Every structure is written in C-alpha cells, then in structure tokens.
Amino acid sequence: QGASVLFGAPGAGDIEVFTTRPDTLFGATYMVLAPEHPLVDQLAADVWPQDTDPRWTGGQDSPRAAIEQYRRSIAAKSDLERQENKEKTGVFTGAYATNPVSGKPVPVFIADYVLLGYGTGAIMAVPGHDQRDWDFANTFGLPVQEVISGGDVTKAAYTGDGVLVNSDYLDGLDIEAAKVEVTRRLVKDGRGESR
Numbered sequence: 759q760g761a762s763v764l765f766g767a768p769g770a771g772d773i774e775v776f777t778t779r780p781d782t783l784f785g786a787t788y789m790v791l792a793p794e795h796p797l798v799d800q801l802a803a804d805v806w807p808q809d810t811d812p813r814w815t816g817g818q819d820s821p822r823a824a825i826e827q828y829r830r831s832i833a834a835k836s837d838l839e840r841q842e843n844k845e846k847t848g849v850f851t852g853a854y855a856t857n858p859v860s861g862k863p864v865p866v867f868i869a870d871y872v873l874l875g876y877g878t879g880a881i882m883a884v885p886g887h888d889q890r891d892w893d894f895a896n897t898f899g900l901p902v903q904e905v906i907s908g909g910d911v912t913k914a915a916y917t918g919d920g921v922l923v924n925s926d927y928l929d930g931l932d933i934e935a936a937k938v939e940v941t942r943r944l945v946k947d948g949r950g951e952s953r
Contacts, residue, residue, distance in 0.1 A: 759778065759937075759952075760776060760777060760778040760780070760952070760953050761776070761777055761780040761937070761940065761941045761944065761950055761951070761952055761953055762774060762775070762776050762878075762950050762951055762952075762953045763775050763776070763777055763780065763783070763858060763882060763944060763949070763950040764858060764944070764948075764949045764950050765789060765855035765856065765857070765858060765864065765880075765882070766855060766856040766858065766949075767797060767801055767853060767855045767856075767866065768853075768854075768856075769800070770797050770800040770801055771797070772949075773789060773791065773795075773797060773855055773866075773880045774878050774880065775789070775878055775880050775881055775882045776877065776878055776953060777882055779884065779887065779888070779937070780936075780937050780940040780941055780944075781905075781906075781922065781928075781931075781933050781934075781936035781937045781940060782884040782886070782887050782888075782905055782906065783857065783858075783859050783860070783882075783940050784857075784859070784860050784903070784905050784922075784924060784925040784926065784928065785884045785885075785886045785887060785903045785904070785905035785906075785924075785925075786857060786864055786882045786883060786884050787864070787865075787883060787884070787885060787895070787900055787901040787902065787903055788864060788865045788866070788867055788883045788895075788900050788901075789855055789864050789865070789866045789867065789880060789881070789882055789883065790848065790867050790868065790869050790871075790872050790880065790881050790883055790894075791851075791866060791867070791868050791869075791872060791879065791880045792868065792870075792872040792873055792874045792879045792880065793825075793828060793829050793832060793868045793869070793870055793872075794829075794874050794879075795868065795874070795879050795880060798825060798851060798868055799825075801851045801852070801853035801866055802821040802822050802825055802851055802852060802853070803821045803851065803852025803853055804820070804821075804852075805820065805821075805852070806820065806821065806850075806852060807852060809865075810850060810852070811850070811898065811899050813897075813898050813899055814848075814849060814850035814867070814898060815849065815850065816828060816849050818849075821849075821850070821851055821852035821853075824849040824850070825849060825851065825868065827849075828847075828848070828849045828868065828870075831847075832847070832870040835870060837873055837875075837876070840870045840871055840873055841871055841873055841876065843870065843871045846869070846871075846893060846894045846897040846898070847869060847870060848867050848868055848869030848870070848894075848898070849867065849868060849869075850865060850866075850867050851865075851866045851867065851868060852866075853865070853866040854866065858944060858947065858949040858950065859940055859943055859944070860926065864882075865900075867898075869894070871894075883895065883900070884903075884905075885900060885901075885902045885903075885911070885915065886902050886903050886904045886905060886906070886911040886915060886916065887905065887906055887911075887915050887916055887917060888915050888917070889914065889915045889917070891915065892911075892914060892915040903924060904916070904923060904924060905922055905923055905924050905925050906918075906919075906920040906921070906922065906923070906933065907920040907921055907922075907923045908920030919933060920933070921933075922936050928940075
C-alpha cells in the first residue's frame, strides 16, 4: 500500500523515507531529518546558499553553526516532547536531495519532531497534501505545491480524492494508479520498493 523511497544526497549516499502517499512525490518540497541523523554532518554545506531563508538559519553564520546550536537547544527534550511538539522548530542544513522520480532539488532540514528509532529517521514533506507538513511549512515559509486537484492549498492541505496535476507524465492519473507508478519507477531505478 505504502512505499519506501530513497532520496539521493550528493556524496553522502541515500536518505530513506516511508510514505503512505507515493503518488504525491512530485509535491515533495523539502525533507526533514532527525537532528541526530548520521548523514547530517556530511550534508552540512560550507556556506548558506542564496536560496536560504533567514527563518531557516537560527541567525547563525553557517550551516554547521546552526546545526550544532539547534542540537544543543533540544538535547534535553524527551522523545514524546519532541514528537508531539506543538511548536515547529528546525534549521536548514544547506543541502539538497534529488527527488528520485522528478529529479528536482529538495532542501534538507533537521527538526526535533523527527526521531531516530521510531521510523526511518527522515520524512518527505508534501505540505500541499499533509496537514502536519502544511503547518510546518507555514511557520518557515517552505514551498507548497498542489499535485492533487480538488482542494485549495493556499488555505490548508488537501487530503481528499482527485487526479494528479503538476506531476509531469503522471498528470491526469487517479491516486491509486499514481501510487503504483511511483513505486514501479523506484523499483526499476533501484530507489525504493513497496512497503
């Protein structure tokens, strides 16, 4: 029903996520990793790229500084404290992963509501069609992309039924067919499997 999805990160191997909505993969506009994720240190960019939003930096000079300050601000928090967090916190790593189907860049964030041990340690965020993502995106200014017609993503995530849009060669497909097509492409390209 769902899918495991591998996002390529330059020079650092793969970031694995699990999603129940592989059909929304063209709508993934960012990734969120657990702050303790083993790849975070390698992903940290030398400088903030020009597309960095000042709400993503913690006010720090560099990705490394933002990451180590964030890690310290959350080190004491319990694991339910983190996962049910009503406040959205996080920082940008500077890094971009490759969308395994569309090939587009996906900025990589860390945030304490993602935890090691309770899942893959990374999620793919589709704010257009996942309310939790919509709220996190809303506080930081992350992009919000509609890929399922039928709602209004400027106001809230659309979790209902509709056909695919803004999804290249998936355009017009039913959600159930798009789920399979994305899974089969991942399998064929060695970038995931059904789960």
